[PDB]
Every structure is written in structure tokens, then in C-alpha cells.
Amino acid sequence: KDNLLGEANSFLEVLEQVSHLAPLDKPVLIIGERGTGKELIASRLHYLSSRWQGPFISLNCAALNENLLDSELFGHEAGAFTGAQKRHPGRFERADGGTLFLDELATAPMMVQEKLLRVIEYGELERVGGSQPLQVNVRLVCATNADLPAMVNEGTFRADLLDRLAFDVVQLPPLRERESDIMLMAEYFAIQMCREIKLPLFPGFTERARETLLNYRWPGNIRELKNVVERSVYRHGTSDYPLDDIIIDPFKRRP
Amino acid sequence: DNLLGEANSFLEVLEQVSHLAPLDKPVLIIGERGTGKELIASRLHYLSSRWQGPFISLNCAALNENLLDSELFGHEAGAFTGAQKRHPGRFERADGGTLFLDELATAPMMVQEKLLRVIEYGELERVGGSQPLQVNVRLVCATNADLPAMVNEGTFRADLLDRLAFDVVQLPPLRERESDIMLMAEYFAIQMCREIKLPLFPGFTERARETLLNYRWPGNIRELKNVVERSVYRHGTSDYPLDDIIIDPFKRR
Amino acid sequence: EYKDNLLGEANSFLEVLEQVSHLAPLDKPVLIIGERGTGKELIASRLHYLSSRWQGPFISLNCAALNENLLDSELFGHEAGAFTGAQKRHPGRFERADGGTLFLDELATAPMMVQEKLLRVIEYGELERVGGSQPLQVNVRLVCATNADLPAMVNEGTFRADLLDRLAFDVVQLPPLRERESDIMLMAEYFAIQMCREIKLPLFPGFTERARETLLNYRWPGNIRELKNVVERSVYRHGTSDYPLDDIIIDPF
Amino acid sequence: AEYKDNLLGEANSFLEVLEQVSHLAPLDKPVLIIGERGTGKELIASRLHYLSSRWQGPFISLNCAALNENLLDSELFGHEAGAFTGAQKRHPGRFERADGGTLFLDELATAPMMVQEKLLRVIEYGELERVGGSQPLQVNVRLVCATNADLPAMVNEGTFRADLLDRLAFDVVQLPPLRERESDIMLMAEYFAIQMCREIKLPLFPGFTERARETLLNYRWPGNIRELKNVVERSVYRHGTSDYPLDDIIIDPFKRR
Amino acid sequence: MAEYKDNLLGEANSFLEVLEQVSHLAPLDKPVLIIGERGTGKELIASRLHYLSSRWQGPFISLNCAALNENLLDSELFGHEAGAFTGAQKRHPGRFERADGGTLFLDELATAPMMVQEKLLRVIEYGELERVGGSQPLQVNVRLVCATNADLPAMVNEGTFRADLLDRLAFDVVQLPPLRERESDIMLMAEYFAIQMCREIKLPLFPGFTERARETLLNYRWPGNIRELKNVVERSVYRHGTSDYPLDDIIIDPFKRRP
Amino acid sequence: KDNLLGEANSFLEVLEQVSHLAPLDKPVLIIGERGTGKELIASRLHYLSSRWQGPFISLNCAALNENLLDSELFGHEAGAFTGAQKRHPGRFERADGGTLFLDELATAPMMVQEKLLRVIEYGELERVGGSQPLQVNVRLVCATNADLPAMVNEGTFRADLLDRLAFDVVQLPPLRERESDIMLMAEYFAIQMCREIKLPLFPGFTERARETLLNYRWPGNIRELKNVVERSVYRHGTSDYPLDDIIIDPFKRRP
Amino acid sequence: MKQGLQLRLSLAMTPQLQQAIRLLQLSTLELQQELQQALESNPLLE
Ligand SMILES: Nc1ncnc2c1ncn2[C@@H]1O[C@H](COP(=O)(O)OP(=O)(O)O)[C@@H](O)[C@H]1O
Ligand SMILES: Nc1ncnc2c1ncn2[C@@H]1O[C@H](COP(=O)(O)OP(=O)(O)O)[C@@H](O)[C@H]1O
Ligand SMILES: Nc1ncnc2c1ncn2[C@@H]1O[C@H](COP(=O)(O)OP(=O)(O)O)[C@@H](O)[C@H]1O
Ligand SMILES: Nc1ncnc2c1ncn2[C@@H]1O[C@H](COP(=O)(O)OP(=O)(O)O)[C@@H](O)[C@H]1O
Ligand SMILES: Nc1ncnc2c1ncn2[C@@H]1O[C@H](COP(=O)(O)OP(=O)(O)O)[C@@H](O)[C@H]1O
Ligand SMILES: [Mg+2]
Ligand SMILES: [Mg+2]
Ligand SMILES: [Mg+2]
Ligand SMILES: [Mg+2]
């Protein structure tokens, strides 16, 4: 499919579950830490999914405000629209039969929440008069980094609607918990950045870098992975000289 | 199966609802979190003489355009630019038949007073066409009980709702329903297997059935459907009986 | 003739109605200390029908909780200025009724700012438009009704006591359900007749003294409307002119 | 031009105040009213507006307190184009009201210290506090004030800054307290009683019962703008004694019988 | 050029030296910053600077933060160019655009939005700003004027004042001698104000003031240093009349209820 | 290129770090104290980047309008509409490669935070009524007088808000920290300030005052040093005046 | 709430209505009479 970061037993099982869900057009949930890219994984699995070649929706959550699905997802394609009349494309109508991914869906308001709840209850929220229904055939996807478990417990979203929006919630475990893909990512990023930073060679994570990583809590995980990647890009040293002090923390004050 | 089997008490309530369906009286309805009080309404509407008439059910208080309550009856376009006003409206769409409300829960106190007054007196007038209100054919309200109003008083303007005592319908819990719950689950499973094009029903351990029965069913049959979906996807095979049923997709391993 | 709606056998109700007739012949301000259900909007109709100018349009129906922006717009508007919700000149204005009179309800909800604007209009009708010079006045009497103990509200300084004084050329206490008890059975009979005719029931097949005692024991926190629509639900429970309603449930709650 | 209003004000101090107003008539500086709510503060204000106006002189008796909205008072500061939902349309507004006149404020405390200081920057200078070409309109405008709040109390609130209270103040008029005047109270009371007996077209004036007159004098009536007239209409409700003279004073309108 | 000060409020104690320094700063093009009691010579100082505008044609433009519209005055802050906010039409000059090269007669209005403070700091960084919706800004010039009444350092310490505010502000401090402090021309400026009051009131001649009057004047701090004294004097022009007025001090505190 | 030189070992280190980062178009921020010439530093860097001859125009977060927020980074179509106007490029298009620094970044709202999180993508710009996104990736940089670690401690700065920055934070020495070129920096500041003052050349400059000034917090390090210098220059206003007992302590009352 | 000139906002007679209203702008007695003669159609119009 695509070049992938992480082939661990957990990562491999994730790939297997992705294959299982790929036929499953029923909406599901892939949970994980941000700065990893589970959305890209969803895109690859969608290429493997029912829509082997189909549409795709990015749909960052807080990209629409005071803009209903009717404003953007449904659109104003027909005549007699607001202002002077013309054609206007709509997302949720545009990408039927493809992929419908919701980015940072945990970042959500109550009103859009009530909208999407009915959209799920009816297949799509539809437009205008209450006599008009709709359904969307795109592969519905969504993800964020928040444990909604308490958000619904706090009522930030409708708990029943939360239950409705998916059919199988899956959570990506911490890469820091893995801490084995540490070396694999280090090497892959070393090659990629040697191609990028145009270095003579990859310095290689010397003993101190490995020890620090072993001690590192790595809160950002894949986010912290790219963070350490940039950090070592700062701490290049020499292409020959293996990087023992590879990490570079911006917050710290040297000397 | 695709219809509302319903428990015995639920069956009696269903008979009462199918009877009240011919009664086109304005109503306010209450169903559980995942009970699905809408399908019974559709069955009643078919049983109602309003079966032939339009039955536009409220679109979850959707907020398209700025017409809002004038969305109930508005204009399409000025003749000079676009099309004729063409008398299209929301309160008009449910014409000759039922009229169902949805997401009545979300409203604040002011719009609550507005709805109470509309119940007291309703008129429909639009820049585009429109037609007189005070008919509200086979009117019925629903989804208000999701967010109670004036439960300890206050909240929304439900003092008039206390005054406005048109009949209402409760919603027993799925755990309290005691219907053919396993049968409904099996029906859903068969429907999914057809949808999934599955080889067959792999089966279910009666021990697994009893263990899954250890659940409040907070989403009622909706919770049942979600748990069944998760359990089957975990099974992912038609080979052996489902000794596992999904408690919650939120977990760790 | 105003239909003598809810003709109150209560003597205090009769005195209140006599005062209502006297003041309605007058064209002077007045207050009504009454509750929703306790004469909900009925006295407004009494004033409109017995208005000092019967031809003078008394729209009444001011039990209107409108948002601060919404209420202020309901008072005043601007042509081709601001006012995103409406368009161009705002005919929507308290001057909508000239020749008749002007009333208020849910008046406890009036902000001190809105209350001040109202008192200013009461003393002198001017500046009733968001746009332009509004010295013009539409002649109309003043009346209102809210259920709050507005003496405490002013003791709380909740709104302008200026209107509270100026408008209150007569504050009329109005009867809740607990006030009228002798007329309770008669009003129940009147409502039952109205329902049977409306429900096409020939009549109530029979009334049990137990039924009357139970209904009287069942209080009416909403003085009329709660009792009225409770009777609606109870008749729906009975539904048969042949079947007497001895214990027809008033309300689901 | 316009005569000051007729008002039964037999209080000799009230007469002195009227004389003070007479002195202020040609004068062009701010005036305050420290009159009570229900002390005819607006009434004396109108008398003043007529007298000092003295040549078809415009007045303005408006309360931004009635202007319930912030954007409302913002519009009261004129805008030429893009004014709220409006776009490129004229709106003279309150500026025209004060054009060739003065400003009379009834209980101006409700104004925010932001609004207060807006008015402060307007007062001494006068150039147009409005979105307009160079906003240079320092119109020939005076001002006058009326509120029941206390100056130290306002300082505690701080809603009136130092220069606010000061460049606000050039004259002050505390209306005679409703508790202060006793004889003039019954005097204006009889005046209004006659006014009612006339306007109501009642063929007979009931007059005034001695017990009723004594009760009215004992009645605090700290509000007496028309709360006196209100109690007058209260007894007029107990009409039918037009030939008679029987006491009927409505103390608690909420209370019945 | 050299113009007669339209006012003659001078307090010889230090406002003489203050005026000397102000004249020194008058040719300068750096930020003009002032501080002191409102109703006390400070807006008068603003007049002083505005006349003290080197050469002429400098637009003595004054905009007061309290005299504005929250969430809306921004359209007039850096300018307006496009439709849907300035009523379409043309590039609508904002308060800043209304004064290019002219005086930024700001006073420390201490408006609630520190956002306003930053927006001004955005204007006051390098002489550059943009009308609303303009894809191209405009780097401009204008005289800059500030006047205050409160301890900006305290509020910044209290976090109430944007440190950046006083930072982009305050080319230097300009405080004022209080009426409890200046006390130089009490009788002299009193005579000047009384002369104006007589020229208005058309009384026959100067009524005169007793020594007890000046005694109470010394006893008074005069909270509105330049103004509250003028209030006393103006009220003195009222009440009793003619030349007989002399003793019995004067009418200083209108707020003071009559004895 | 014609800005104040720090003339410090830390200042030299910062200059070298900027020189190293000159080709790097990766996202960045100015940590430390804005209003101490972080603006000038970023500007001179924009002059000397890999795209030295490129269109660079910085921007401040707190500038635009909440309603016009969508019109901030971009432009709306509004063809036959109320705000009818031509296809407008807008900011994220208006820069297109150069340095548009994220100033006032500490002064942002959570809604603007969502906007930036959308901007975390290299272009892919969806406008109002737009058909297809456009990828406008540019040399990216910001400024932060605040401690984003403490900000995420308060949480108002999202973890993604921190993630947007793609550079390890270079920090400059505060007033107490730097205190290196204080005499020389004061000398240059006096040169400029007296060139403004047009007074005769200062015959008096006593370094004992400079020493006592070193015994001061100088919270406005870059600004207030020269500020008090020029303020004392104006207050003294004398050429033959030694740097003795002269100080701009506006908080202090004169005696 | 408050109002603003910028918002999602929801006309002017064109061609046919222009000549129509011009018939009103033209005098009905004679100026419109020439056009009415020029009609020469809509036989269902006596
Ligand atoms: N398996 C992987 N292979 C390559 N890159 C990856 C992998 N997982 C994550 N990434 C990197 O992590 C980033 C995650 O981006 P994205 O999915 O947009 O985050 P979010 O979903 O929080 O917006 C991607 O830019 C990608 O380069
Ligand atoms: N007795 C029943 N007969 C048929 N379908 C049912 C029954 N109970 C539950 N359902 C299903 O449960 C789902 C609940 O969906 P929804 O209407 O959103 O629930 P609610 O009305 O509680 O919000 C419905 O789609 C419906 O198909
Ligand atoms: N001389 C008078 N005789 C009778 N009534 C008077 C007289 N002067 C004033 N009033 C009454 O006092 C009422 C309140 O006046 P006023 O106190 O000026 O109002 P405001 O509260 O605006 O100051 C008016 O309605 C008026 O009828
Ligand atoms: N030294 C003075 N001599 C005479 N009059 C003065 C003097 N100082 C102030 N005034 C009076 O104060 C008024 C100016 O008020 P001012 O202090 O400028 O208001 P603000 O404080 O709002 O700028 C003038 O009318 C003037 O008569
Ligand atoms: N290293 C330095 N040497 C001499 N003068 C300096 C130095 N740094 C700053 N300055 C002076 O102080 C001022 C600092 O402002 P600036 O650095 O532009 O603020 P910012 O960069 O934070 O916007 C400049 O105008 C400059 O004249
Ligand atoms: Mg993403
Ligand atoms: Mg539902
Ligand atoms: Mg008044
Ligand atoms: Mg001033």
C-alpha cells in the first residue's frame, strides 16, 4: 500500500483489523495519539476497502463554524439559493461512495453534534424541509486523540449519539509503550533525512541517544518521534559521528 | 423483524398508539435513548387516515438559512432574480397528513414560550405564498423528553408545558421491556449477515447470551445493535457459536 | 360577545369581571395580578372586546418572551438600518395597534432597560424606531399582567419601578385554580361538553360522584389550561360517549 | 418662545429653584437634576427646556437606559456606512435631536463608564462623536442632567470618572423632596383633583375628604411624578361619589379589599 | 510657528517648568505621553500640544476608546477598504487613516480590551497599518499623543495594564502638579477665571473676594485641579450677584447639600 | 542587516543559529521576549533566508476580524452574493513562499487555534465557495514572548499549537542575562537618540552611571535601556553633561 | 443579537419588466398606445 511507520505485533494486528474493517462499510472508530497519522492509515485501508478507487473526505472538525452541513457538506447546488441564485457544490453530497473521514471529531459543538446524530440516524441529515431525507454512501470515518469516555460522562456530546456514530471503536496503543519501533523509526527517518538534509550519511543514534530514548517517556510518541527527528536534525554532529546527544528539547536553556 | 415486534405491555401500548393514530390531535412523544420511538410513529401514520397525506417529520431543528420559524413558511426567490416564490415552506410540507417533531429537547426557555404560544395560537404567513395555520394536521411532537424542561422548574419555559397537558407516552427501559430480546438480536444479526453476505450465523453460546444480558442496555435496542455489530465484527467468521458478545468497544488489551 | 369563555361562577371572579368591564370602557393603564392558566390571555380578550374603541384594534396577546434584541426589535425597528433579522422598514412595532390599546405579559421578564423604554412610552410615545425621528404616537391605553411579586423585584431592583408605578393605574388580582372551588364541577361539566362536542362524543355517558371527588382532589397547578388539556387526555382515555369516564387519567405525569 | 410648564409647586423653595432656572435660562452650561424618581425631574426639565430654549429651541429627553443594547447606543453614535447590518445608508439619529438645543438625561447612571466617558469626550469639545466625514460636527448644543444616584455612591461605583462627574457638572437641581413639601403637596393634590373632575367629564367634583386629605399628606409618596396622580386615579376609580366626598385611597394595588 | 496659548492656566509652581519642557519637546517627533488628573490641565495640555503642533496642517485627531464600539470599532481602527463591513463604497478611512501625519491625540482611556491595546501597538510599531480587508497595507506617519491619569506601572504589576502597552507607549513620563500641590496662581488664575465669568455674566464689575475666600481656597485640595476650581468660580458667578459679593467665601461644592 | 548587534557571546550564538536556520523554511517561533527585537531578528532573517529575494510580509495574530477570520488567511468567492467581489487571494496565498511571521501568537483565541491547526497542512486551502484546495507552503516562523510550556500547563495553547512549530527554540539572554554590550549598546543608542535630539555632541558620558544601571532589572531590556537613555538625554538636554545621576525612572517621583 | 453588514445574506427588474414598467413610465394615453398597437399579438386580449 504505502510506506508505513510501525510494523510491531500491535501495529501488525492493527493492519489486520484494518483489513477486516475494510469490507466493513459500517462506521467505526480508530483512536490514537495525534502526531501519528491514523488518518493516513485509514486512507490506505480505504484504498484496500470497499472504495478501492473512490472519493475521500478530509473534514477537519473545527474548519466549519456557523456553517451547517447545508452550508458546506450539503451545499447550495440548486437554483434559488441565498443571495443571487447559482450552483454550489456540497461535500457530504459530493463524495458518495468514497471515504468520509472526520478529523479531530472529538473537537465538536453540541449543535453540529445534534446535526450529525440525525445524519447517522437517517443515513444523512438531508436539507430544507423535514419531508426530505438523504443518505451518504461514502466510507464514514472519524478520529481524534481525546478519550470521549469522560466527555459524554460530562455530556460534551450525546452519549447515545456517540454509541451510534460508529460500530467498532479501536484505540492505537502508545508508541512509547512499544518503544521498539523507536529504532526502526530512527533508522527510517535517518535515511529519509539524509535524503532530505543532504547529509553525507546518517550519523546513527550513538549509545547516549539510545539510553535517553530508553529512559524517555516519549509523551508525543510518533509526534515525539518526528520531534526527535527534527531534534537530531539540529543535533547532527557529523554524518560519521554517531549521534549520542541526538535529542534537542526547545524548552531547555543550555548553559 | 424489520417491524416492531414489541413486548406484551409494549404490544398493548402499540395497539393504543395505532388507535390514537386516527386521532389527529397534537401530541408530544417520549421514547428511550435508543428505543427508536420513530418507527412506531411511522406504523401509526400508516394506520392513521393521514397515511396518504404528507407527514413531514421535523429535521432535528436544523438551522438552514435565516428563515428559522419563517422556514415553517417562506419565499423562494424574487421574480426578477431567479424563480418564483413558489410557496415552499416547512410547516406546509406536512400537508394532508401527519406532522412529526424532532430534537424538541435542545430548545431554550424563550423558544419554549414561543412553542407554547404557537400551541395556544398558531398562524402561518410567508412572503412567498404560504397558507393559514391553526390546522396542524395530525400534529405530534417528539424528542423533547431527551432534555427535560423545568424539571425542578426553570430551564426552558415548560410551565405552559405543564399547562399544555395533551396526552404523552412514556418509554420503558429495554432492560425493563423483557421482550423477545434474544429474538430481536437474532433478527438484527440475520439482517446484518445478509448485509454482510456472511456464510451463516456462526451461533451464540447461551452462556454468552446470559453474560451479555448482564447489561443496563442504556442505548436500549440501539445499544443492542451496536454491541451485536461489535461482537460480530470481533467474531468476523461464521464458523463457531459466538461465545463472545460485545460489552463495550471502549476497552484495552 | 366574547363567548363568556370560562364563565366564572366565583363571586370574586364576577367582581373582577365587573372591574374589567369598567376599565375596558375606560382607556387608562392597568395591571392584572394573575397567573398563566389563571386567566391565561382571557382578560386580554375581555379588554379587546370591551375596548373603549371596539373598532380600535386591540391585538393584545403580549405573553411574549422575546430575546433582549428580539424584544427591543418588537418594540422598535429601523428602515435600511441594522436589524439583520428583518428587512427595510419595520412595521413590527408596538404601534401595530392604534385606536385600540396595548398590553404586556410575561412582564416579569422585562429588563430594567426594556422596562424603562416602556415607561417612557407610557408617559410619552416617542422614539419607537431604531431609525429616524420617532416623535409620533399611536394612541392606545396600557395594561399588563405578570405573576411575579414585583414588589420584591423592585425590592430586588429587577426592573424599572417607574413603569411599575405609572402603568399600575389599577393592579387586578386574578384567581388561580385554588381560588375557584364551587365553580369547579360546573367548569368541569362545561369542559366535558366542549370536549364531547369537539371529540364528536354525544356526551359524557355518566359522571360518578367518586369521579368528581377525584377530579377535585386532583389539583390544577395550571388553573385552567392544565385542567383543560388534562381533561383532553382523560377524554382521549375514555374516547367513548357510551363509556362514562369515572377515572379517566388526567395526565401521563 | 416656549413658556415653562404650569405646575402646582407652592413650595417656596421650589419657587426659588424655578428662579434659579430662570437665571440659568439665557445661561449655556450643564445642569443636573438631583430630583427624586417621582419628583417631576423630567417635568421641571421640560419647563427648563421650553424657557431656556426661548426661540423654538430644541430639547431632547431620552435615556440610554432605555437603549437596552450596546450596539443600540453605538448606533446612537452616528455611522455613515456599514452600520451594523446596514450598509451605506444615512442615519442622523440623536445628533439631530440635540442639533441647536441641549441634552436632558433622565437617570443617566445606567450608562457604562465606557458610555459615560464617550459622553465626557463629547461634552466639553463637541465635535461629532459619530462615524462621519471628519466627524467635525460641534453642533450648537447644551446639556442638562437628572438622576437620583449619589455622587459619592457613583464614585464607589466609579461609573462616573472624576472629569466625568465634573465636566458633567455645571449646575445641579435637587427637586424638593416629596417628604419635604407638605402644604404644597395638598395644594397640587387639589389641583390634580380638579383636573381630574374636569377631564373625566364627571358632572360633579367629589372634592376632598378631610380624612382623605390628611391621609394623602401622611402618604409618603416619595415618587410624586404622577404617583400622586396615580393615587388620584386610584380614588377616581372609586368614582360615583362625585356628589359625595368619601375617602378611598388605594394603598396596595396587589392587595384586594 | 509661535502662537499665543489659547489658554493661560499656568501653575507657576512647576507647570512653568513643565511648559518649558513641553515646548522643548514640541519640535520633537517622538511619542507624546502625558499623565495627570482629568479635568486638570491635561486635556488642556492636549490643546497645548495641538496648538504646539510644529508648523501647521497637523490633524489634531482625538479618538477616545470609551467613545467607540466594542468588536466593531476595529473596522474604524486601522481603516476599512472592502464591502460587507464599510457599506461597500470605497476604501473607508479608519480613525488611523483619517489622520495621516496628524496628531494621535490619545488619552489613557483604559478601555477594558487589552486587545485594543495590542491593536494600537500593531498600529504603533513602525508607522504601518492596513484598511479592513486590504491585501496591501500602508506604511504611514502621524503625530502621536498620549495622556493618562493612573499608575500604569501598578496596573502592569497588577497585570491590568499590558506591559507591552506602556512599553510601546511612554516615550517619557509627564506628570502634573496637583491643585493640592501646584497652588501657585490660586488667586491669580482665580481672577482670570472670574474675569471670564464676568465677561459672560454681564455683572457691573468684579464683585471681589474676601480673605476667607482665599483661605478656604488654600484649605481646598481642588480635586479637579484645573476644573473643580473653575466649578467653584462658576458657581460663585451664580448664587448672589452684583458687586456686593465679596465675603461669605464662594460656591465650591455643588454636591454639598445646602447647610 | 542594519539592525542592533547584540555584541554578546549569547548574541553571537543566536546570530549563528539564525544563520544556520536561514535556509530552513520549516515552521519556527521567536521565543524569549517579543518587543526586544525578535521582530527585527525575524525580519533580517527573512532578508537572508534561502529565499533571500522573496516576498516576505509578516503578520500578527491579534490583527484581523472575528467575522473576517475566514477572510484573514484567504479570500471568499462571493460571486453573485451579498459581499459580491472578485476571486481574492488572501493572506496564506498573498505570501506564497516568503516569511509571514506569526506575531501576536500569544494573543490568539481557541478558534484561531483551530484555524492554525487547519493551517498545519502545507496549503491545501479551501475557501468560501472554492472548488479545489491549493497547497501554499511557505517559510514559516512565529514569535512568543511567552512560555508555551506554561501555556500548555494552562492548556490554552493546545498540544497541537505547540506542534505547529517545526524548530527547536533559540532563546536570547534577558536583560539580567545579557548585560554584555550594555555600555556599547548604550553608546549606539545614544548616537541615534542624540542624532534625533540634534543637540551638540555629548561631552559628558560617565560609566559609573552605566555600572549603576547594570544594577537594575531593566525589564524592557532592548527597549527600555535605550528608552531611559534617550529620556535622560531629553530631560538633561545638555551636551556637556556627564552620565551622572541621570535616570528615566518614570515610576519614581521627581524631587 | 446585534447586526452586522457582513453575513450569509439571502430582486431588480430586468428586460421584460423594464419595458413593462416603462409603459407606466410612458404615458398611458398615447405613449403606451403606440406600443399597444405594436403588440400585434396575443389575440386573446380584447
Ligand atoms: N506509518 C507511518 N508512515 C509514515 N508516516 C507516518 C506514519 N504514521 C504517522 N506518520 C506521520 O505522522 C503524521 C500524522 O499526520 P495526520 O494523520 O494528519 O495527524 P492528525 O490525524 O492528528 O491530523 C503524518 O504527516 C505522517 O507523515
Ligand atoms: N421494537 C422495535 N422495532 C423495530 N425497530 C426497533 C425497535 N426497537 C428499536 N429499534 C431500532 O432502534 C433504532 C433506534 O434509533 P433512533 O430512532 O435514533 O432511537 P431513538 O428514537 O431512541 O433516538 C432504530 O433505528 C430502530 O430501527
Ligand atoms: N404642576 C403640575 N401639576 C400637576 N401635575 C404635574 C405638575 N408638574 C408635573 N406634574 C406631573 O408629574 C409627572 C412626572 O413628571 P417628571 O417628574 O418631570 O417625570 P420624570 O420622571 O421624567 O422627571 C408628570 O406625569 C406630570 O403629569
Ligand atoms: N488656570 C486656569 N485659569 C482659568 N481657568 C481655568 C484654568 N485651568 C482650567 N480652567 C478652566 O477649565 C476649563 C477647561 O477644562 P479642562 O481641564 O481642559 O477639561 P479636561 O480636564 O477634560 O481637559 C476651562 O473652561 C477653564 O475656564
Ligand atoms: N543589539 C543592539 N544594539 C544596538 N541597538 C539595539 C540592539 N537591539 C535593539 N536595538 C535598538 O532597540 C530597538 C529594539 O526594537 P526591535 O528590536 O525592533 O523590537 P522587536 O525586534 O522586538 O520588534 C531598535 O530600534 C534598535 O534601535
Ligand atoms: Mg489531520
Ligand atoms: Mg433520536
Ligand atoms: Mg425623567
Ligand atoms: Mg478633556
Residue numbers in the entry:
A (entry chain 2), F (entry chain 3): 5 to 259
B (entry chain 1): 6 to 258
C (entry chain 6): 3 to 255
D (entry chain 5): 2 to 258
E (entry chain 4): 1 to 259
G (entry chain M): 1 to 10, 13 to 48
Question: Which sentences from the paper describe this structure?
Answer:
Bacteria use sigma (σ) factors to recruit RNA polymerase (RNAP) to promoter regions of genes that need to be transcribed, with 60% bacteria containing at least one specialized σ factor, σ54, responsible for transcribing many stress response genes. The σ54-mediated transcription initiation requires specific AAA+ proteins (ATPases Associated with diverse cellular Activities) known as bacterial enhancer-binding proteins (bEBPs). DNA looping enables bEBP hexamers to engage and actively remodel the RNAP-σ54-DNA closed complex to convert it into an open complex. In this work we capture intermediate states of bEBPs in facilitating DNA opening and partial unfolding of σ54, and therefore link the ATPase activity to DNA opening and σ54 remodeling, which eventually lead to transcription activation.
